[PDB]
Amino acid sequence: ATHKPINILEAFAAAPPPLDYVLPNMVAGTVGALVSPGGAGKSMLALQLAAQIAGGPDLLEVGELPTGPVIYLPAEDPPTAIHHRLHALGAHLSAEERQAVADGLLIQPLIGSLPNIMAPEWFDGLKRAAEGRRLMVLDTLRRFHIEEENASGPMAQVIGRMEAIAADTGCSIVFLHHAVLVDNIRWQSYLSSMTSAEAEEWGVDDDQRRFFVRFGVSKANYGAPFADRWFRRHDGGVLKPAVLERQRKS
Amino acid sequence: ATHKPINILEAFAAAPPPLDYVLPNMVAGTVGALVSPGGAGKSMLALQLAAQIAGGPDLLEVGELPTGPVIYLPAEDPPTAIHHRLHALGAHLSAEERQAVADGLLIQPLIGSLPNIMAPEWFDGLKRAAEGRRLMVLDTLRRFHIEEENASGPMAQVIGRMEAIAADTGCSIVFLHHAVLVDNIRWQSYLSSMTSAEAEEWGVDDDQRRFFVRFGVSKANYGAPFADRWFRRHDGGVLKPAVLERQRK
Amino acid sequence: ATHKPINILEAFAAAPPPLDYVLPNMVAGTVGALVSPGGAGKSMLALQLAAQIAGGPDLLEVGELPTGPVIYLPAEDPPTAIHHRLHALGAHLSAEERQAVADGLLIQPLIGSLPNIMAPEWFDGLKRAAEGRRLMVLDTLRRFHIEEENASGPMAQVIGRMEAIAADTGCSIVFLHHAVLVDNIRWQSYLSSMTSAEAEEWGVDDDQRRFFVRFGVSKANYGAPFADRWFRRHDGGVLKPAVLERQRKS
Amino acid sequence: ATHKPINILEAFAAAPPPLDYVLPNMVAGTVGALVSPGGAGKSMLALQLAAQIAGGPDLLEVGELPTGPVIYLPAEDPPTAIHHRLHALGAHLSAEERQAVADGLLIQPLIGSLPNIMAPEWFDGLKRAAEGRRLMVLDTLRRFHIEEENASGPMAQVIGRMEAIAADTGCSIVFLHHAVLVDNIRWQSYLSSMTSAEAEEWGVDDDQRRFFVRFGVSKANYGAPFADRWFRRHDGGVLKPAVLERQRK
Amino acid sequence: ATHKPINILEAFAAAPPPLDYVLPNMVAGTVGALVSPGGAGKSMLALQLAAQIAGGPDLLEVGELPTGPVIYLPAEDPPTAIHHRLHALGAHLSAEERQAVADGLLIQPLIGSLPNIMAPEWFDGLKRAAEGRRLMVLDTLRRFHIEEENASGPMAQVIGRMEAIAADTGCSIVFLHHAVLVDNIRWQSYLSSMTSAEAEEWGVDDDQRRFFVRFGVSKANYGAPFADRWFRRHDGGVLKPAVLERQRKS
Amino acid sequence: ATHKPINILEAFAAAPPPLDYVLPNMVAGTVGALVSPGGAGKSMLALQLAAQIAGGPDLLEVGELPTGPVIYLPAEDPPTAIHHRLHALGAHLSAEERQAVADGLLIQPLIGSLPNIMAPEWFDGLKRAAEGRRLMVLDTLRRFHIEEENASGPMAQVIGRMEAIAADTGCSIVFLHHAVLVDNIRWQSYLSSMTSAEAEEWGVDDDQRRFFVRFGVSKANYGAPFADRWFRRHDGGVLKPAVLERQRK
């Protein structure tokens, strides 16, 4: 929110200091987006990412990430659904990993709460909930505001508010979005369920395509290129790397 | 609503009780949508599903569903037409089944009442009607609000309000919609009138396709897959499983 | 406008009681639409329908319809035009049919009156004019409101008002519309003038196509399917069934 | 206006007096439109029709029209240009015809006046100008209102206001329009500059087509059909029947 | 702004009096538009036209034009740019032509001034600056108002204001516009830079197309047809007739 | 600003001093735009140009530019990222060049500050920051206003405000824009990531094109033509002339 001018001479003289990535190619202290059609698994993947930064294992094999307290704000799923996802995830975690996640990760369900980042008391409240956290996840942005998502003005105000919170507190904010916003943000990732055409090409049967999703970073400023991943959906929806041959057509 | 934080150790350390589904793949206490072109059979389907959850028999053969009080709010169809739809359904029901349904279903006609969920009087009224119930059916959403249906902001408000009602009271809300409103609903089912192409697919004569409708869940969160069903429309439009053989070419 | 809960047990037990159709496949007590391009004959056909429900003959051969007092509200044609249509229609009516129509049908011209269903005094006034009538015809809806016809919110308010009047009074309301609204209504009929292509297919010369219009019900919930009709336009525009061979191309 | 109910027995029992048409197929006391791309000759056509109804001769050969006082309101063309258009027309008129036209036509220039029919002062002013007249010509509508021309709501208001004026006073209103506004006007005529295709159709050389314009009634309520006319543009743009032979291919 | 009724008998009887054209086919006392993409040379051509009506020479060879005081209001170019264009133009003018232009032409730069014709004090001020002038040039209209250029209502108000000023003062107003408005105006001219395709057709090399622009009148009511001109851009951008052979393809 | 009338005799009678360009083909004291898709290198290019006008060396080889104080306002990138971009650039600079740049460049981070040029506090603040400076860089415009970017009215206001600031203070403003806003800016430059087609054109392998970006001036008023440049992206994204041979087919 308020900054001193850069000390230029000091930025030239001080050693090349590594960018700090909250998520692959996302600079810590900023706002990013996870984008996909409803149902593709954003809520699972975000949960897994949240748990990982909280100190659980890199199950997705996206690479090791700095740890810190995390706050997950699901506003669309009822608590009981969150319990199920957690329990399913839990089967993949050791006793110590589980404990680290429980220490590091706050999940504060907001279904029916009607949170509105443009109202001063919700702004304050989201800002207080970001304080002391390294990551905040909004699942999904649509439930945190009552603006027209296709209006760039109101959306600059909505995103600007998240930017102010991330800038002041150092808590990165990632919002999920059901598939503009994209132009208003600097880091963008996505999920897409395996299509009929992608199925007939990584050599998986059509009746099995529902078990795989592509994950990538479609927008970022900085870092080494991030290769698109395939994930297999295990029980409860838990995502892990998929082992896929790929079809060099004759 | 107002939620305590999730207790994570506790969720890891023991199997939660099974998810409670109000409809196939729809978790209880949430908001879902039923969508189709006007005329495709939403009223009849919803009325049948409402009567099954109220305690009636599983005529649609969608599987056994937990029962509980249902309230059905038709805002487009006059009482006379609702009487016709109910009587036709009635002919499939024994006295006991009729009793079970009447004990569990309230139908509150709303034609001409102009309910507006963005008005505090109607918001409170709908919330009190949801209290203690398992399912509330809004037929159709177009009649419960005076906003622009392709304005995402106002629709987020309308939907937010149903979500508050569902979360405070535990009562699920299904709204029906005549084909943005769907992008941010987590459960979505549809009805689709059998087309000429599909009639040929299932060896049904063209002059007969209007007796057949397809039902499906097109969006839901992870869970047991639910197969697309064909229903036949009997008299008064009552829907029952269709007996159709697949064809090749 | 306000209703008791359905008595369910009574709806099961009471005999299958016939739907009451104000017009073919239109449930009495509701709102419906007659839709077509300007000039296709909506005003004639509506007049003929009005006269018929008032107790005149089924000249269009759409089938016999329950009788009742009718109110026709033309807001677009001057009185003298209405006189001409009436006089022309009159030539097709017996002395007793004429008298029945005059007893049953009120025509209250509204050209230049500026009626607005969203203003409380016009609402009240339309409601009072529906009272005691079985059918009210608005010719055309565009003259009864100052909303954007392509805005679904304002149009839900405009149609909702007609629904409130039809529900309270039992007077069905049919509005004409010059070619949304269609999604906001449950019964929809149309007129379309015979095209060049339809002419070369029911075997009528091109210079004669102007004498025929297709009438159908493009939307309804209930009843036996209503077959599209051709009508011939006689003197003054009066519509009657047309006798058309139809062209099985070789 | 305020109308007595139609007396139905009386309308059945005797032949009404003939419809009174202010223009071919346009009933007197209503609102109609004349439409064309800017430049196609609306001003000249309307001025000629206004001068014929005022009492001038039938140069357009559209048939004899009832006469009565006309008021013509050009809001886009400066007086100098109107003087030019009138003088050119004048050369077709005898002294007697010039007199008849001046007795029956008032032309009130409005360029720069910014008349707004939605403002009470201008609504009253136009209504008083219509009083006792047979025709009022608004050239063009774009200059009599400050609304969006493809906003149906505001345009219904603008048009409603002309309809009130026409019904209270008996004076017909024709507005001209440079090509929603047309969907809800009951009489619509047009002008169309002869195209290359049409030039070939009527054996006119391409370098000459700009001397020819087509006139027609594209919408009207039931009545005697009115054939599309070709006009030739003489000096100053005066329009007169064109002498053109149809061609085949 | 306010007019007496036409004396009809006098318009018939008084001799055929020549229309007074401020610019080719533009009736004096009205509003017109010069339209083109940014960068095509509107500001030069308008300057040249302004200087010509002020009493400088017909360098563009558009035909001789009545003289009168002119006011040029550039709101987009800084003074120093105007000085350069002037100096370059000056090289084409005799000592007497220069003096006539300086006597006749006021240039009042408005860059950064924020003029708004919808504000009463700017309206008054533009009206006062039109008084005593034969031509006023607004370069470009976009800087004289804060309305939506694609909204026909607000644009009727903006143009209506210019029409009121031109009608009262007899000062014609021409606004430039960077490429609706066109339907709201009766005289329209344009500039278009020579395209790749026009280059390969008037037989000028591609690397030379940047030296030519087409000028025409795309909309007018009155006068002899105005032939499209090619202009060559000389030093400083000064426009003069181009000598172009034209390519009758085999 | 407030301008005296142009003295025309004086402008004709003597050669004005040369135009003063702040950037190639952009007259000093005006507003210009730099446009590209997000990611294409605007921040780096602008930072390099800002450092050159501040007194640094001409690494881009766009020609010698007059120097003067520059203020750079990044509103999207966190300080950490700006430190990285500056350090990378720093590696191309001698101690003296580092000094010259630090003497002439102020960088005021704005992430999360939500500057709004339509608010009087921010309008005044930006104007005082422009005072006495030669260049002000707004990175990007989207963060300096809360209007709709394809609403011409509000954008005319936003741009009008920059033009007032530039004219009152003499400080040029360049805003960057992630690809109406461009139709009414008089100077426009762009960056374009090398495409597959272009890679083939300049014999660069596809897996290498992401190291190359094209820079150009796509709109400016009459003046010396400025050729499109290819830049190579070195570490941290520093841009320098690319050494590329044209290919034929």
Side-chain angles (χ1 to χ4, degrees), chain F residues 67-80:
Chain F
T67 63
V70 181
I71 181 176
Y72 185 96
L73 305 164
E76 315 189 352
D77 239 16
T80 33

Side-chain angles (χ1 to χ4, degrees), chain A residues 122-142:
Chain A
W122 275 99
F123 177 80
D124 291 345
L126 285 151
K127 197 201 198 183
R128 287 247 106 196
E131 292 179 346
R133 332 276 335 179
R134 185 167 157 88
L135 182 62
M136 171 177 276
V137 180
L138 307 182
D139 185 355
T140 72
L141 186 63
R142 180 71 275 180

Side-chain angles (χ1 to χ4, degrees), chain E residues 105-124:
Chain E
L105 175 56
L106 167 61
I107 305 172
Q108 171 54 67
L110 285 179
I111 196 175
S113 300
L114 300 178
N116 171 8
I117 197 166
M118 290 306 294
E121 74 276 1
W122 275 99
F123 177 80
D124 291 345

Side-chain angles (χ1 to χ4, degrees), chain C residues 49 52 56-65 97 241:
Chain C
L49 260 3
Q52 152 184 28
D58 183 17
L59 292 176
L60 310 156
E61 299 181 7
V62 294
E64 236 54 44
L65 289 171
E97 276 151 343

Side-chain angles (χ1 to χ4, degrees), chain E residues 39-226:
Chain E
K42 289 187 298 303
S43 292
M44 244 295 103
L45 170 88
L47 186 53
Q48 290 186 235
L49 260 3
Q52 152 184 28
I53 292 163
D58 183 17
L59 292 176
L60 310 156
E61 299 181 7
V62 294
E64 236 54 44
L65 289 171
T67 63
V70 179
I71 184 176
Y72 169 51
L73 294 181
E76 292 187 17
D77 270 319
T80 46
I82 309 300
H83 305 148
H84 274 249
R85 295 208 177 99
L86 276 162
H87 179 66
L89 183 54
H92 287 80
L93 265 54
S94 76
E96 286 82 327
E97 276 151 343
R98 286 181 201 197
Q99 184 65 65
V101 168
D103 299 343
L105 175 56
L106 167 61
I107 305 172
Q108 171 54 67
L110 285 179
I111 196 175
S113 300
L114 300 178
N116 171 8
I117 197 166
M118 290 306 294
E121 74 276 1
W122 275 99
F123 177 80
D124 291 345
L126 285 151
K127 197 201 198 183
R128 287 247 106 196
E131 292 179 346
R133 332 276 335 179
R134 185 167 157 88
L135 182 62
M136 171 177 276
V137 180
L138 307 182
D139 185 355
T140 72
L141 186 63
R142 180 71 275 180
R143 301 305 202 272
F144 294 80
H145 77 94
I146 57 156
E147 309 308 324
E148 208 64 31
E149 279 190 347
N150 86 4
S152 61
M155 295 313 297
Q157 299 173 83
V158 167
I159 284 143
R161 277 170 182 233
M162 282 180 293
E163 273 165 18
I165 294 168
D168 274 322
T169 62
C171 190
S172 299
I173 296 177
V174 170
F175 64 81
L176 319 202
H177 168 72
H178 299 313
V180 300
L181 273 60
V182 79
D183 310 3
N184 252 297
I185 47 88
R186 274 184 112 58
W187 183 86
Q188 224 227 164
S189 61
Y190 69 89
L191 238 16
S192 50
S193 306
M194 188 188 256
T195 57
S196 239
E198 290 170 337
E200 324 207 318
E201 155 161 285
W202 290 87
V204 340
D205 303 344
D206 198 59
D207 64 6
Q208 302 291 292
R209 62 189 259 241
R210 80 156 184 281
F211 290 111
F212 312 89
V213 232
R214 196 164 92 266
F215 173 68
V217 166
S218 58
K219 220 172 143 199
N221 290 293
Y222 309 107
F226 181 86

Side-chain angles (χ1 to χ4, degrees), chain B residues 25-39:
Chain B
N25 294 111
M26 183 174 161
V27 176
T30 65
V31 180
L34 161 54
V35 354
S36 87

